[PDB]
């Protein structure tokens, strides 16, 4: 979950 949050932020 920590490891997947940055991908989500970069998409916003």
């Amino acid at each position, epitope marked *: 979950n*920590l*490891s*997947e*949050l*940055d991908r989500l*932020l*970069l998409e*916003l």
Partner: antibody
Amino acid sequence: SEVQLVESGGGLVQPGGSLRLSCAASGFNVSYSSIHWVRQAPGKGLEWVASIYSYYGYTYYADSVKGRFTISADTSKNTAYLQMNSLRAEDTAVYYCARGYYGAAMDYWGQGTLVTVSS
Amino acid sequence: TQSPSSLSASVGDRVTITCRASQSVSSAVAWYQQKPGKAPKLLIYSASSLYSGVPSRFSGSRSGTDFTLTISSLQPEDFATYYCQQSSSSLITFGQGTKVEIKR
């Protein structure tokens, strides 16, 4: 606007003492990014300390600092902080701030600041 | 093993570093270069993706549980210390790291 991270604070603190490091960001919005603290004891490897994801309100900590250190962010000042309490000798290290990228990879880094814990 | 391993190499040599961050198959893995008195520089992310601006001689690879960084031809500026990073769902771990020194 060029991306960078400027660290402030640090220095000498006695065991059991408290100290706050600052990480002022520019070129990007801290509220839509992740900030990470990583430290390095003299002649030793990199050690992850803490991470913050302001947008989601998630914070994570290494077991070695859990309950003693607190990571936080001030959106209005575009700055992240590491509050270090109950310091011990083995916390002596150069402390880096860094911005997160895919997979918590760290693309931009601060200049580092030395924290010495000793009597 | 709290301090980085040492490796002696010559300019033009091929070097492959294996990650020891006690990682898993799920892990998102990154690689860094650090020189004395300087902050680390990102080389690889997501196991095998080359970060923007990083020379193509650096490559990352994943084989099961084993994560690897290869420098296909060592250049003078490549002599430095290298670390892998493994990110789990709630934790980041940096590996021991390898310090590449010049053979002479």
